[PDB]
Amino acid sequence: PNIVIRKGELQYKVMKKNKIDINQLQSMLRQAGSFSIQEVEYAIMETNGMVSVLPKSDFDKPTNKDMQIPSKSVSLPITLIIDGEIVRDNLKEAGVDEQWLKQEMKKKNIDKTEDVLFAEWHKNKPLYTVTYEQSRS
Amino acid sequence: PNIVIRKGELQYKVMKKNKIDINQLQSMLRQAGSFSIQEVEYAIMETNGMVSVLPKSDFDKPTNKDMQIPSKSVSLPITLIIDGEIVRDNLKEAGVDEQWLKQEMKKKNIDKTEDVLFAEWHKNKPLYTVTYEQSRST
Amino acid sequence: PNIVIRKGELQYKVMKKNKIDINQLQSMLRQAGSFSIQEVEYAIMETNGMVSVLPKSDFDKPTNKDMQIPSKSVSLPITLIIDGEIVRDNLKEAGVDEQWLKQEMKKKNIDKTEDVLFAEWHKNKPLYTVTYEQSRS
Amino acid sequence: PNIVIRKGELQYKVMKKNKIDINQLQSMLRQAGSFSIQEVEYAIMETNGMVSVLPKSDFDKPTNKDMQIPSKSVSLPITLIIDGEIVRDNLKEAGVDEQWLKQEMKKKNIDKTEDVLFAEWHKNKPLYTVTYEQSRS
Known part of the structure; x- marks a missing residue:
């Protein structure tokens, strides 16, 4: 599991090595909800050749904890x-x-x-x- | 439908049978939005090969009822x-x-x-x- | 576009015609984030076999308008x-x-x-x- | 990467070029969460045949910034x-x-x-x- 964006930074070394350019990564980010690389904190290339995105705090959606909703039964x-x-x-x-x-x-x-x-x-x-x-x- | 995470616990017995290790499951959870096993209440290994995640309350997203939004026509x-x-x-x-x-x-x-x-x-x-x-x- | 759940109701004639029983529908709904059929207002069997899901109001997620955030430029x-x-x-x-x-x-x-x-x-x-x-x- | 909806407007020349009609576009939009064309600001026909969707401001989900949740660490x-x-x-x-x-x-x-x-x-x-x-x- 290679990290293609680390702390908001494009990692060009592992992009070459995992054989993905910008156009491809940008397209993979949009299918995950991030419409610019500027909004991404972490991006991880997976085994099946999929991208996983941890958006930067400001662009992420609020969790239950962040909105102080009491812990519920799941x-x-x-x-x-x-x-x-x-x-x-x-x-x-x-x-x-x-x-x-x-x-x-x-x-x-x-x-x-x-x-x-x-x-x-x-x-x-x-x-x-x-x-x-x-x-x- | 095999349950690979029950009430927050890794079910190691069902992971051996379905031939998925730790690093495969974590990858799969990441693709469904959960970036650590610790945030998952329930994970279900589907017959088509994907996992379905129910996160723990704290890491889930608020619904309309939780934010006391009025019932809309859908x-x-x-x-x-x-x-x-x-x-x-x-x-x-x-x-x-x-x-x-x-x-x-x-x-x-x-x-x-x-x-x-x-x-x-x-x-x-x-x-x-x-x-x-x-x-x-246009 | 086959409507497999309409107004919360399971459409059994349409499921049988599309060759999906209850366990398969449930599994497809879970992949779309709905962990019970009671939380679904509409479910639509797409032409490529996937199921599109419209959650009932209470189980859906707040939009910007619901939260009364003013319109911003996209x-x-x-x-x-x-x-x-x-x-x-x-x-x-x-x-x-x-x-x-x-x-x-x-x-x-x-x-x-x-x-x-x-x-x-x-x-x-x-x-x-x-x-x-x-x-x- | 082709843009099939720009600023809420269907791009019919682009749609005919890419060989997608209205029905097929709607199904694609539904899988991405958009249940009508009127809720979409931008739709991008992606290289692998998936659609990426930027919803209009009112139909999109609020971010942490919108909700004035302070920058947490990612x-x-x-x-x-x-x-x-x-x-x-x-x-x-x-x-x-x-x-x-x-x-x-x-x-x-x-x-x-x-x-x-x-x-x-x-x-x-x-x-x-x-x-x-x-x-x-």
């Missing part, structure tokens, strides 16, 4: 039911069981668990369900 | 006229007729619809027209 | 010098001339026009130069 | 231990030594350097260290 959703069939492994991974499903089926007026095309569990959300009815609509 | 534009010809089904999608177009043509000094290279309808925007004369003017 | 920079030689076409497109260039080279202690490896113009701004010197230091 | 992490073996060059680049390393080991309750699968030095963070024992968990 979690993946879990697919409980797919195509009318309950997914086995995903029940215990979400720490739920078939009792919880049927209680939540009745909470949204659903009759069997094969009436449901798709259902997903999210930590900070109600249970999401797409019925076979809802999918013709 | 909708797609619809092409009404393309290459001089009015599109059939796209008028109905817009909830609009050929009557409405000619009134809006007169709103931008346009005689016929065949003087129009491109016309686009959007829910929260005035109608957008590019004439054939505008195509050559 | 302008592409133009490369005027590459590898010692001044590009002829890029001079008359940006607006400037060689009279302007050589005056600007005098501003930064540059002697001849062949001393410069890279120079870019930005609007009404101070000209950016990278001399052959700086490249190896 | 840097890359440096890996110090990988697969049990300490990287030679990486200690010198980070401005530390095995003297500093082994004192950091005792701060994190690890005895020898071979117990560590991965360790990275970040300029504005405490030393990251992943032992085999929490590799096993």
Whole structure:
């Protein structure tokens, strides 16, 4: 992983060696969001021949910390039911069981668990369900 | 879908199986915007070969809800006229007729619809027209 | 342009016709940064197989207008010098001339026009130069 | 590198030259985040068939400068231990030594350097260290 721009400075030695000129690098930067080399702090040529860009502070976008937004819960959703069939492994991974499903089926007026095309569990959300009815609509 | 980073931890067992080392993963995370493993809550090795990154809260970017921005209408534009010809089904999608177009043509000094290279309808925007004369003017 | 999610709703007839099931869609959405289908208002299967994603308002990112930042000028920079030689076409497109260039080279202690490896113009701004010197230091 | 949209205006002569129609351009813009042509100030048809997009001021995302977040420091992490073996060059680049390393080991309750699968030095963070024992968990 060679560094083609270090601390805002074009590194001509490794550009030659990695066989990329200016026109090519400029084009690779624009596909990553940086429209001039003046806005770039770090640029790294990768294995697959892609460029990774760390923009200079002033041109970067603000993170959650920078805007003092309180640290929030970040979690993946879990697919409980797919195509009318309950997914086995995903029940215990979400720490739920078939009792919880049927209680939540009745909470949204659903009759069997094969009436449901798709259902997903999210930590900070109600249970999401797409019925076979809802999918013709 | 194999999880190569779970709750901030390198899953070394799934990295051996999928044949990706540390230096490959870091490169892959860089391409998705994360410049250190320490900034990643979740990384998912997709079946097409790429990784998908969920960053830790502190290194993610604020959403509209986080900045208490009001819920906007989110909708797609619809092409009404393309290459001089009015599109059939796209008028109905817009909830609009050929009557409405000619009134809006007169709103931008346009005689016929065949003087129009491109016309686009959007829910929260005035109608957008590019004439054939505008195509050559630029 | 196939609309695979419309107004938050999974369009099951369109997915089946385009030969993508729920796990594949999810994976494609994640590549576009959306980690759950509940966070998506529109998803569009492009002709080259990629999925374009419009997040629901609350999960999308603030624009400049949303943050009530006043409109600023947006302008592409133009490369005027590459590898010692001044590009002829890029001079008359940006607006400037060689009279302007050589005056600007005098501003930064540059002697001849062949001393410069890279120079870019930005609007009404101070000209950016990278001399052959700086490249190896 | 061809400019297909300049100052919000489609360049139809350039589009016909490059053999791209409206539909094809729109799809390209959608993959770059732009969901209408009206939100684009500049679009650049790039050498490898991708499009680069500068959105109009109102539709672009705010930078740190726009938000008056002060200039924070931008840097890359440096890996110090990988697969049990300490990287030679990486200690010198980070401005530390095995003297500093082994004192950091005792701060994190690890005895020898071979117990560590991965360790990275970040300029504005405490030393990251992943032992085999929490590799096993």
